[PDB]
From Swiss-Prot:
Function: Methylates ribosomal protein L11. Preferentially recognizes free L11 before its incorporation into 50S subunits. This function is dispensable for growth and thermostability.
InterPro entries to which the protein is assigned, alphabetical: Ribosomal_L11_MeTrfase_PrmA (IPR050078), Ribosomal_PrmA_MeTrfase (IPR004498), SAM-dependent_MTases_sf (IPR029063)
EC number: 2.1.1.-
Reactions listed under catalytic activity: L-lysyl-[protein] + 3 S-adenosyl-L-methionine = N(6),N(6),N(6)-trimethyl-L-lysyl-[protein] + 3 S-adenosyl-L-homocysteine + 3 H(+); an N-terminal L-alpha-aminoacyl-[protein] + 3 S-adenosyl-L-methionine = an N-terminal trimethyl-L-alpha-aminoacyl-[protein] + 3 S-adenosyl-L-homocysteine + 3 H(+)
Loss of function: phenotype: Mutant contains unmethylated protein L11. Null mutant is perfectly viable.
Name listed for the protein in its UniProt record: Ribosomal protein L11 methyltransferase
Domain of life per record: Bacteria
Amino acid sequence: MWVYRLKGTLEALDPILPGLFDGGARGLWEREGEVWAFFPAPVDLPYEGVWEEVGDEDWLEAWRRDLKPALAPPFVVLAPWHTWEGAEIPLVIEPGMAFGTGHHETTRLALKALARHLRPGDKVLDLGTGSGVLAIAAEKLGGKALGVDIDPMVLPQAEANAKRNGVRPRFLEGSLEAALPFGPFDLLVANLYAELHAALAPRYREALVPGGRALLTGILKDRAPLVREAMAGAGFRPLEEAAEGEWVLLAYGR
Ligand SMILES: C[S@@+](CC[C@H](N)C(=O)[O-])C[C@H]1O[C@@H](n2cnc3c(N)ncnc32)[C@H](O)[C@@H]1O
């Protein structure tokens, strides 16, 4: 069989799904920032995804075996079965159902930015923690991390990842509101999406001490202006922007 890989979620890709089935798709799986569509053979489709031959085997196992260490200096994200000879700070993460294996651009943007902005002793909020990777990273850098997620299903994944890495961040079900009793914070890192950053911008100011920093990603490049506006409106000072592929991270201070 063949896989046709599309960037996005099922929610975003909703209008074209019928066409994939019309083209002969027998299955679909939502993966980390991608949707995989499974066909007996390739067909010419207008949707600008990528065809990959995956057949004769277990597609999941082939994907799993092909995974390599993910560099995000000063870190390297490793599956439990990887080794790494470099001097990078290892973050051992099981590539599971929760977003945050280290293989997505946004996660990597967030990890690199954390290292540039975190001061040891800093109280850190990881909003939308998923696998726990950013909270784990924050602990490695000398931060005191709290990771929260609206999906309670990610929490035992995050706890298990923390244990594997010899760190003890706090993990809790909820959103920014559930975090607020534990703040204010020195540093907020939030790999979410543009519309949600914009909506939350006022509460972000709230969540941070004076001098605090907000590191926002999960932002598509053409949706960035939306975030720049909201953050400016809440009195944030822009610090730096970083990009990878179609994604950006926007760093702010107050
Ligand atoms: C793009 S993933 C990022 C995960 C991890 N922080 C990383 O950087 O790879 C976003 C996570 O935020 C969670 N999430 C979405 N909306 C949220 C909200 N309003 N409050 C808290 N978490 C949210 C999702 O369930 C998902 O686990």
